[PDB]
Structures are given as C-alpha cells and as structure tokens.
Design an enzyme around this catalytic site. Structure first.
Site, mmCIF file in Angstrom:
data_model
loop_
_atom_site.group_PDB
_atom_site.id
_atom_site.type_symbol
_atom_site.label_atom_id
_atom_site.label_comp_id
_atom_site.label_asym_id
_atom_site.label_seq_id
_atom_site.Cartn_x
_atom_site.Cartn_y
_atom_site.Cartn_z
ATOM 1 C CG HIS A 213 -0.806 0.314 2.530
ATOM 2 N ND1 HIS A 213 -0.175 -0.650 3.225
ATOM 3 C CD2 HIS A 213 -0.603 1.436 3.114
ATOM 4 C CE1 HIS A 213 0.610 0.078 4.370
ATOM 5 N NE2 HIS A 213 0.129 1.600 4.182
ATOM 6 C CD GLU B 115 17.661 11.129 6.248
ATOM 7 O OE1 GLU B 115 17.141 11.633 5.031
ATOM 8 O OE2 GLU B 115 17.508 11.497 7.814
ATOM 9 C CG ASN C 92 16.147 15.829 11.919
ATOM 10 O OD1 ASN C 92 15.789 16.448 11.231
ATOM 11 N ND2 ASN C 92 16.526 16.642 12.423
ATOM 12 C CB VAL D 60 18.372 18.041 9.426
ATOM 13 C CG1 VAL D 60 19.686 18.577 9.623
ATOM 14 C CG2 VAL D 60 17.205 19.395 9.883
ATOM 15 C CD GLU E 201 22.053 12.919 5.942
ATOM 16 O OE1 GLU E 201 22.646 13.106 5.761
ATOM 17 O OE2 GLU E 201 21.416 13.485 6.999
ATOM 18 C CG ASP F 95 -0.170 0.525 17.279
ATOM 19 O OD1 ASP F 95 -1.738 1.098 17.171
ATOM 20 O OD2 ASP F 95 0.152 0.089 17.039
ATOM 21 C CB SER F 96 3.530 1.301 13.983
ATOM 22 O OG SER F 96 2.045 0.342 13.888
ATOM 23 C CD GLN G 147 -2.244 8.887 7.648
ATOM 24 O OE1 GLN G 147 -2.183 9.129 8.561
ATOM 25 N NE2 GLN G 147 -2.857 8.580 7.120
ATOM 26 C CB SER H 6 2.142 2.586 6.208
ATOM 27 O OG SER H 6 1.407 2.661 6.900
HETATM 28 N N1 LIG Z 1 -3.048 1.164 14.616
HETATM 29 C C1 LIG Z 1 -1.754 1.322 12.971
HETATM 30 N N2 LIG Z 1 -0.801 0.380 13.826
HETATM 31 C C2 LIG Z 1 -1.493 1.685 12.131
HETATM 32 C C3 LIG Z 1 0.052 1.277 11.567
HETATM 33 C C4 LIG Z 1 -0.412 1.404 9.904
HETATM 34 C C5 LIG Z 1 -0.937 2.484 9.580
HETATM 35 N N3 LIG Z 1 -1.250 3.014 8.762
HETATM 36 C C6 LIG Z 1 -2.492 4.352 8.504
HETATM 37 C C7 LIG Z 1 -3.010 4.352 7.234
HETATM 38 C C8 LIG Z 1 -4.287 5.419 7.693
HETATM 39 C C9 LIG Z 1 -4.768 6.659 6.681
HETATM 40 C C10 LIG Z 1 -6.152 7.296 6.884
HETATM 41 C C11 LIG Z 1 -6.142 8.392 6.415
HETATM 42 C C12 LIG Z 1 -5.451 9.606 6.894
HETATM 43 O O1 LIG Z 1 -6.151 10.287 7.586
HETATM 44 O O2 LIG Z 1 -4.733 10.099 5.821
HETATM 45 C C13 LIG Z 1 -6.512 6.588 6.427
HETATM 46 O O3 LIG Z 1 -7.659 5.884 7.980
HETATM 47 O O4 LIG Z 1 -7.059 6.417 5.670
HETATM 48 C C14 LIG Z 1 -3.846 6.849 5.876
HETATM 49 C C15 LIG Z 1 -2.508 5.451 5.488
HETATM 50 BR BR1 LIG Z 1 -1.795 4.641 3.791
HETATM 51 C C16 LIG Z 1 -2.220 4.379 6.843
HETATM 52 O O5 LIG Z 1 -1.479 3.884 6.231
HETATM 53 N N4 LIG Z 1 -2.979 3.852 10.305
HETATM 54 C C17 LIG Z 1 -2.514 2.627 10.069
HETATM 55 C C18 LIG Z 1 -2.717 2.646 11.932
HETATM 56 CA CA LIG Z 2 18.846 13.740 8.322
#
Ligand SMILES: NC(=[NH2+])c1ccc2[nH]c(-c3cc([C@@H](CC(=O)[O-])C(=O)[O-])cc(Br)c3[O-])nc2c1
Ligand SMILES: [Ca+2]
Length: 223
Positions: free
Chosen positions: A40, A52, A54, A57, A62, A171-172, A174, A177
């Site tokens: 995705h 990397e 930071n 910067v 890098e 947790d991880s 957005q 990913s």
């Molecule tokens: N809780 C987790 N471990 C987790 C992990 C990866 C995620 N990736 C994302 C993720 C969310 C979006 C938003 C869109 C937004 O607000 O921009 C959505 O719901 O579609 C978009 C992406 Br691409 C994600 O990978 N949420 C995530 C949550």
């Molecule tokens: Ca850097």
C-alpha cells in the site's frame, strides 16, 4: 510511533524512509540493492533515503537513491490488505557500513510473546497528527492468534499477525507503514494497518514476512 522513544541516530541501520518530496512510508534494507516495504506504500517517483535520523536535516551518513522498480505482490488485495508487501530495487547499490546495513530474513516464523522492535517516523499521536523529525522506536510483543482474531474478527488472514498492547498507548501509526518489525535480529513483520493508533483492544497488524521468504528470494533472483 505512539508511546515510543527516540532510537538514537543510526541505531536501526536497516531502516529506510521512502520519500516523494516528503516522507510517506518506511522500509527495510535486505541487501545493498533491495528494500522490502508494504504494497500500500506503492507510488511512482520514490527516492529511498538510507542512513537517516532527522528527515528534515542533512547531518551526514545519508544516502539518497532512486528506486529503479517497485514490485508489488501479484496477489495484493487493497481491500483486505492481504499480501501487503512490495520489493523496491535501487538504481545503484548502497554502500553498506555500520550506519547502513541490511537485516536478515527469517528462517522460521516467530511465536506469540516474542518481543520485537518497531521503528519509524510516523505519527506520535493517537488523536491528531504530530510527526517527528527523528526516528522513533517501540518494543512490542507478537500476540496470540486468538487475541488477534478476537480483536479484528474476519479481517486477519494467515499472512498477518498482531503485535502491540491491548491496553493501548503504544503502537505504530500512519507514516510508519512499510517499516520493520525485527525480532531476534530477523525481519518478521512489515507495518501494515490497524484501527486508529494505540487504541485499547485494537493492536497493530503486520505482514507476516516468514510466509514470503521464498517469493522474495525468487523475485530478487529473477530481477
Ligand atoms: N495502528 C496501527 N498500527 C497503524 C499502522 C499503520 C497505519 N497506517 C494507517 C494509515 C491511515 C490512513 C488514513 C488517511 C489519513 O488520515 O490520511 C486512513 O484511515 O485511511 C492512511 C494510510 Br496510507 C495509512 O497507512 N493507519 C495505521 C495504523
Ligand atoms: Ca537527515
């Protein structure tokens, strides 16, 4: 990463940042010319940034290399995120050193309770967006299949596993990913999805890399 800590510059030498004029996903260096990330995270115009810390910067160490090709798994389903894995071949090989190194693929899958390290430059807030400048880390255990399926009934395939804390807070998220889930020095998962970030009873879901080792080797071998 929500509830994590600052990793420290170059302490996660296999971590890469996928950049298209801004950081949008993570990845893992598996050899000097290949990176594994999530399907995705695919898009054209990807520049892979190695060594990397930071991301805003240039501080030294890098290496910015354009991707020559991206190979999304042929059976990737964007609706269920089943087979959420992609391989990126770099235009030139990276110079490996202490700060830039590859991570090993697993020889066996990991068991529930195994502690792993998840890292990334993703959001650090479960409520709102706050993206860090430096790389964040989080130690999380792999959960049992029953707790995972209980949390996401009908959404977990055999190519996924849950890791995290059911109490929430860590947790991880957005931005993370495509990044690595490393347990005992082996790449066992790829940050894939979850319901929100760090919410109670909604752990993160990761691509189960041990099910793709042969595909990865076969594909690299033929490209
Ligand atoms: N809780 C987790 N471990 C987790 C992990 C990866 C995620 N990736 C994302 C993720 C969310 C979006 C938003 C869109 C937004 O607000 O921009 C959505 O719901 O579609 C978009 C992406 Br691409 C994600 O990978 N949420 C995530 C949550
Ligand atoms: Ca850097």
């Amino acid at each position: 990463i929500v509830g994590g800590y600052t990793c420290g510059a170059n302490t996660v030498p296999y971590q890469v940042s996928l950049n298209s004029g801004y950081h949008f996903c993570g990845g893992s260096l598996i050899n000097s010319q290949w990176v594994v990330s999530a399907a995705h995270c695919y898009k054209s115009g990807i520049q892979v940034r190695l060594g990397e810390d930071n991301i805003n910067v240039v501080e030294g160490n890098e290496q910015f290399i354009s991707a020559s090709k991206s190979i999304v798994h042929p059976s990737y389903n964007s609706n269920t995120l089943n087979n959420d894995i992609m391989l990126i071949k770099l235009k030139s090989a990276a110079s490996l050193n202490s700060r830039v190194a590859s991570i090993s693929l697993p020889t066996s899958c990991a068991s529930a309770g195994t502690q792993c390290l998840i890292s990334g430059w993703g959001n650090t807030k479960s409520s709102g967006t706050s993206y860090p400048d430096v790389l964040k880390c989080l130690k999380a255990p792999i959960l049992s299949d029953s707790s995972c399926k209980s949390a996401y009934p009908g959404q977990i395939t055999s190519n996924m596993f849950c890791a995290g804390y059911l109490e929430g807070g860590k947790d991880s998220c957005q931005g993370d990913s495509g990044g690595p889930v490393v347990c005992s020095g082996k790449l066992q998962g790829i940050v894939s999805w979850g319901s929100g970030c760090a919410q109670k009873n909604k752990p993160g879901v990761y691509t189960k890399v041990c099910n793709y080792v042969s595909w990865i080797k076969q594909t690299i071998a033929s490209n």
